[PDB]
Design a protein around this ligand. Sequence first.
Ligand SMILES: O=c1ccn([C@@H]2O[C@H](COP(=O)(O)OP(=O)(O)O)[C@@H](O)[C@H]2O)c(=O)[nH]1
Ligand SMILES: O=c1ccn([C@@H]2O[C@H](COP(=O)(O)OP(=O)(O)O)[C@@H](O)[C@H]2O)c(=O)[nH]1
Lengths: 432, 428
Amino acid sequence: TTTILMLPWLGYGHLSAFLELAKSLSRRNFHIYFCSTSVNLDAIKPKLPSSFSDSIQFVELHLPSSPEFPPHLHTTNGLPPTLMPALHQAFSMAAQHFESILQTLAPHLLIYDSLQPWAPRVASSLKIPAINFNTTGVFVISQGLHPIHYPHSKFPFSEFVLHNHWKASTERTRKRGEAFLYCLHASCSVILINSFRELEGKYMDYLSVLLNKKVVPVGPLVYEPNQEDEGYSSIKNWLDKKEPSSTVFVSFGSEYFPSKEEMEEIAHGLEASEVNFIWVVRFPQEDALPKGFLERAGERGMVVKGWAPQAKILKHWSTGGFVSHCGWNSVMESMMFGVPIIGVPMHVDQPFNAGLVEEAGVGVEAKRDPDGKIQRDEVAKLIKEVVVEKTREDVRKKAREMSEILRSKGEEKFDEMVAEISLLLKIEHHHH
Amino acid sequence: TTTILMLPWLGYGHLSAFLELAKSLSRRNFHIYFCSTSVNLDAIKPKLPSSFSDSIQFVELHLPSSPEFPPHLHTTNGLPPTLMPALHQAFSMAAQHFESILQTLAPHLLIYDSLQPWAPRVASSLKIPAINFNTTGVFVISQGLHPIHYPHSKFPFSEFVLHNHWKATERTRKRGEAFLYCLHASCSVILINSFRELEGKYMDYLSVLLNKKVVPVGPLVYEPNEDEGYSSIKNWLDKKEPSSTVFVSFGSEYFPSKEEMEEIAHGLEASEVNFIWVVRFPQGALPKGFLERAGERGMVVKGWAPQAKILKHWSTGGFVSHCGWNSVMESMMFGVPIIGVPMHVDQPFNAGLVEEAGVGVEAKRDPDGKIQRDEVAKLIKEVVVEKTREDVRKKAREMSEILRSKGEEKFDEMVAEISLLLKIEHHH
Ligand SMILES: O=c1ccn([C@@H]2O[C@H](COP(=O)(O)OP(=O)(O)O)[C@@H](O)[C@H]2O)c(=O)[nH]1
Ligand SMILES: O=c1ccn([C@@H]2O[C@H](COP(=O)(O)OP(=O)(O)O)[C@@H](O)[C@H]2O)c(=O)[nH]1
């Protein structure tokens, strides 16, 4: 009877994190209007069981469309990188439809993602409380805000150094302005963040000071797969043949297409390691591999095209490593399932995520050269040490300990969020 | 706000399972009146975080008391077996106070344990829906109800055979309960503290046996955060090698005989395993040189121990248990193989369940029904000291992984059933 409209950013990782939060809120008696573009809603629907049909309603947000930019392309998932400016521009023009949705549905609360300036603002003009759910980690945000207040001083609690490659406009201009966003309401005085104290507790305390905001951990939000084959049955038979802890899963996410040069280094490092591997290779919605590489690999390697059951593969006992771009959800999934990460970060928050994995001791990062390039030798050495020869038992011990901590978490994970939301509603009700 | 009054039986294990269910219900916006005797309410209160103070309220049930049978004895936890007659009798006399509580609180729903026949009768008189929560396993009940309808036919899905020792007032009441009638939505469904991976077939059979919907809510395992008592135990365990130590406990309601204790002690000593043994005495023992010989390998804790914390310690590789249900659930959740030494009541069935599942082993009693030191020593060496029963250790890890993987969906079926029955019975 208390309704919440949830608005993820367009992007599969954001959609997944919001959906898991939606399920918890639905179980706690909130009615959820889960709002996204049709293609994203369709992509995420397999993960919502029929049990939620009454409580979580999928609500379509309409973006401007054209015959060459139809609604199927209204997502970052597999989007050609050049079409990305159109996606932000079309999303920029979806505010009027969003306003119509809010006026009609009249939700008691809005939970919104961090790439929609208009979303809280539209909610505000209709006197609807709104709260920010940040689907990614704490470490990156605190590192972003720390220079503002301390241009000369050292970042506390970490020895991480950003590589010069990442250290080196319209979105950047937008992000900087967002650092100085004001708050005169209860709803904007707290944020929900998809992390947990055993990994980021010090950073969460620091972030709250930097923001003057309550920081509520609600994570990690890891989707647990069930018993349609998206190729698992074929893959499960292949994995069953392998030795325990002998295989690496290779993925670079739902939004990034590695360069021909980058994938050459990844493939050569994979071949030199002599590891088993399942590599998901994607093309905008082999010809990108070194010649003879898949033949030289033979049955040691399997390439899955387009999409793979990532969570299921990570849970298989043959999997001993995750060569990953270190997108937050993949990092959270690997930690939940106890698979050590061999980090190959690409852009955005991923280098920060790789550093976090490295200090925690659960995984390792393949360092780039001074010119910012992937190194096949570094890729080969880490897979040999972590997976093939298992000379990094410290990393494997830390990963298992971390998994046990994460598995140990129960429904208390959401208690602080529930208490804050109830306060939010009671306060804003009086001031309308 | 929908209000539920929960009435566990007076055993600590029943209190623990009810409290975990109460937390699940509280998080789903039900107000909980948690009702039991003062001694029991005080006993479990440390496991209830302060955040639940608003949503879970402890409501005292008064049993008749005398100077020699004071309220601190109104529990089966540590009770002298010679006072069980008095405990059951006083419990029966508390029915009038229960009615006064229900009349005042007027809960929307009563969740009652399967040991209090007056509780559903008081509830029916006050027009309060009441649903049965069974804290223990499915297997024992289906095993109890199968001969009624199928004499001359063996139990359909198990190769378990009860030992003669166990085949050799309460039973009279229990037998009548098998035929109790249901004419209401509240009695048409029962919540049980189990999970289909271990008892799925038995649940389906029990549903037919009872003509009732069986809703699994388990396993309900308390995950821990004396408080300083662990500090001494943790230091000792930290010196041990990984998976080198057995925890030994026989529960809150049974005191093994001197002969039983000696067989267990000699089995431990011969095995040469590291061990933590909780030895307790009734409210208000070992071979002569046992501890001296054991030395650093052996530690005895008196009265009560932090079972869950010890079981999660990496040094712990085995649990010698009496096989009470909650202890079995905890061992499976934490991946510790059970070395079963069942004593009485439902424990033999639970031990048989553990063995067939493959997560643990059962120490067999001799033809006269006695504990055998040789059997105890053999199993511990096979499972803990010399890990030759790797099939058992593998199955235990798999089971813990299954249990740890379970999430909030565990309670969806219960919540739907409660919603339905309340709406149905409201109309009448
Ligand atoms: O072949 C694939 C690729 C990705 N994923 C899932 O898609 C999400 C990716 O989110 P993440 O934050 O890891 O990275 P992003 O795509 O946002 O860069 C994760 O849940 C992955 O498990 C998947 O199931 N199969
Ligand atoms: O020294 C002890 C003995 C028991 N327990 C707890 O008490 C419960 C035992 O319940 P069970 O159903 O296994 O046996 P019962 O006492 O009912 O026979 C479990 O939570 C144990 O972890 C404990 O904490 N410390």
